[PDB]
Amino acid sequence: MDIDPYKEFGATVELLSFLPSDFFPSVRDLLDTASALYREALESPEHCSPHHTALRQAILCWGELMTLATWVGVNLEDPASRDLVVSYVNTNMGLKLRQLLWFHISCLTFGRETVIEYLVSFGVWIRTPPAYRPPNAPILSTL
Amino acid sequence: MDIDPYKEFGATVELLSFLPSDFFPSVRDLLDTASALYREALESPEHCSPHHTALRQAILCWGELMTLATWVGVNLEDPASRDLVVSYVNTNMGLKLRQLLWFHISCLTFGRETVIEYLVSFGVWIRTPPAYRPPNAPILSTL
Amino acid sequence: MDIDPYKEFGATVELLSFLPSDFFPSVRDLLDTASALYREALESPEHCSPHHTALRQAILCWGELMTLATWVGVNLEDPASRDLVVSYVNTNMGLKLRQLLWFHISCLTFGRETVIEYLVSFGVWIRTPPAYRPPNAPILSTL
Amino acid sequence: MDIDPYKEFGATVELLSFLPSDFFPSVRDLLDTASALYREALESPEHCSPHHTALRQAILCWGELMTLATWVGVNLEDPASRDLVVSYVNTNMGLKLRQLLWFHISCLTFGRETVIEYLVSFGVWIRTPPAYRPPNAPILSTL
Numbered sequence A, B, C, D: 001m002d003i004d005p006y007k008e009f010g011a012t013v014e015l016l017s018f019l020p021s022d023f024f025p026s027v028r029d030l031l032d033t034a035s036a037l038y039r040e041a042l043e044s045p046e047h048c049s050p051h052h053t054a055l056r057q058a059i060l061c062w063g064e065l066m067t068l069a070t071w072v073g074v075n076l077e078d079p080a081s082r083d084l085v086v087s088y089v090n091t092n093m094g095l096k097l098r099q100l101l102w103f104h105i106s107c108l109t110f111g112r113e114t115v116i117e118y119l120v121s122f123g124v125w126i127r128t129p130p131a132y133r134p135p136n137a138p139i140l141s142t143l
């Protein structure tokens, strides 16, 4: 259907494309963060939060994609096709996955308000000229 | 990580293994069932339930896999590899997807109690050898 | 008819006469800013604000100008004339559109008072010669 | 942004498509009307009405387009391209413009109710076959 993975949380794809795709960390970094910070809660038998629910489902989908890529590397013979499939996965699906993981982890960590203000401000910043914007890029911090 | 997509709700992959893989409907059937019963709630900007939160993500994963299948059929010149990939997707990932869709649509339509009692009773029925197995299997119903 | 697009809002062309050309983001940047912050309201059936009204009208004007530029590229056979017209559009009309979009977005974001005080101070700064002004311009930011 | 310039006022492009293109008066006539009736209010420093705001923006866009046409006739030497650009501007853009100006002037002058009723009634008239189409086409009047 026409489902937006962020609108039940108060965001939208138009608001997360408002940031560059070269901004979002790697899938490995984000999954390591998720583990480190919320493993006991994602492996828990509790609806701890919708963020946790969505994050579980996304981690499962990524695991199945990795299984697919390994199965490809094993079975498929044409290296061209194999590399092409694996690259498509890791690039397009990786970008989507890490936008979503960033959103969820960062909301869990800072706040929906904080994260949305950050999106707005960082987009406006990277769109503003340097001479008239602050010189240092915005960054989220618990400290 | 080791995430079970059901223990958040009160089930396990071992409890749903009571049902064989030849049991679950097709993805078309289940997505149509969802579009019939819960479309407006899935397209809604509300955490109506964890079942919705999870079913949305599952539907998005499936949409991305279908997009992948089309992109493959287009951008791959080895029909053998193309067919292999599409078949793997639609078979393995479809089986998992429809396990999950079945669980969610059922616990949304009937409830945890009914669904788990159904799984137990169907395990009884299907572990029972056929000489003593009634024909009237357990069939979820509001009637 | 001797109309000023800001007099209705409490400003003047002579007040924004000082902001340079290098101060305003690109048209794409500003239109994306709008689409991300106020799309649900601009596409709304409500007079949410005079800023919204003006901003809708400006967006439509720019759309018709882009349509013109495309029609030119398609229906003119003198590359010189085509390039000259498209350049004029994107440069002069783009500058005016940037000025206006900036004013409206900035007011909606910060406030009429804040924006007008920023304009006063920025004029004070840009009228001073560099030998006597601070080197870093004033800054309007949410951060 | 998919914006409808009449949706914030209570109309649509499908409701105004009832009226043909050869129905709307000339830009000269409509701007003369606007002057005569609302010059002091359009030149005013007040959000007198959303119609006034929109009308100001439209007049400004038309002025910039006329400036473009003049700049063209001056700089551009290729008569073919010059005439093509000028005629495109006038015909098509002025069609859009006189739609908009008609709507706003008419609403300001008569009423939202009167204008929407006029649109539906002119639809009735123009859909009626000629054998039963009265020659006294509908017309807006305060008498």
Ligand SMILES: COCCOCCOCCOc1ccc(C(C)(C)CC(C)(C)C)cc1
Binding pocket: A057, A060, A061, A062, A064, B005, B013, B057, B058, B061, B062, B065, B091, B092, B093, B094, B095, B096, B097, B099, B100
């Ligand atoms: C191939 O079938 C074997 C049986 O699978 C059951 C055991 O695995 C548990 C199911 O786990 C998942 C994992 C991922 C998914 C999602 C929602 C991510 C969808 C999918 C399969 C499209 C990737 C669903 C169920």
Ligand SMILES: COCCOCCOCCOc1ccc(C(C)(C)CC(C)(C)C)cc1
Binding pocket: A005, A013, A057, A058, A061, A062, A065, A091, A092, A093, A094, A095, A096, A097, A099, A100, B057, B060, B061, B064
């Ligand atoms: C190539 O990247 C383009 C950027 O598109 C991002 C916006 O598109 C919306 C899609 O949103 C998502 C995000 C994540 C996902 C999940 C979590 C289901 C995982 C994925 C990408 C592995 C299928 C699906 C859709």
Ligand SMILES: COCCOCCOCCOc1ccc(C(C)(C)CC(C)(C)C)cc1
Binding pocket: C057, C060, C061, C062, C064, C065, D005, D013, D057, D058, D061, D062, D065, D091, D092, D093, D094, D095, D096, D097, D099, D100
């Ligand atoms: C060529 O005309 C075909 C008619 O198509 C109808 C389209 O829907 C109506 C859109 O109405 C307008 C009216 C004015 C305008 C602006 C304000 C941009 C003015 C213009 C035409 C001077 C650029 C834009 C759209």
Ligand SMILES: COCCOCCOCCOc1ccc(C(C)(C)CC(C)(C)C)cc1
Binding pocket: C005, C013, C057, C058, C061, C062, C065, C091, C092, C093, C094, C095, C096, C097, C099, C100, D057, D060, D061, D062, D064, D065
């Ligand atoms: C060439 O740029 C110079 C800077 O502008 C100096 C005058 O500024 C006044 C702004 O005037 C306008 C006029 C029209 C417009 C509209 C909204 C009609 C848009 C446009 C420029 C696309 C025609 C915007 C601003």
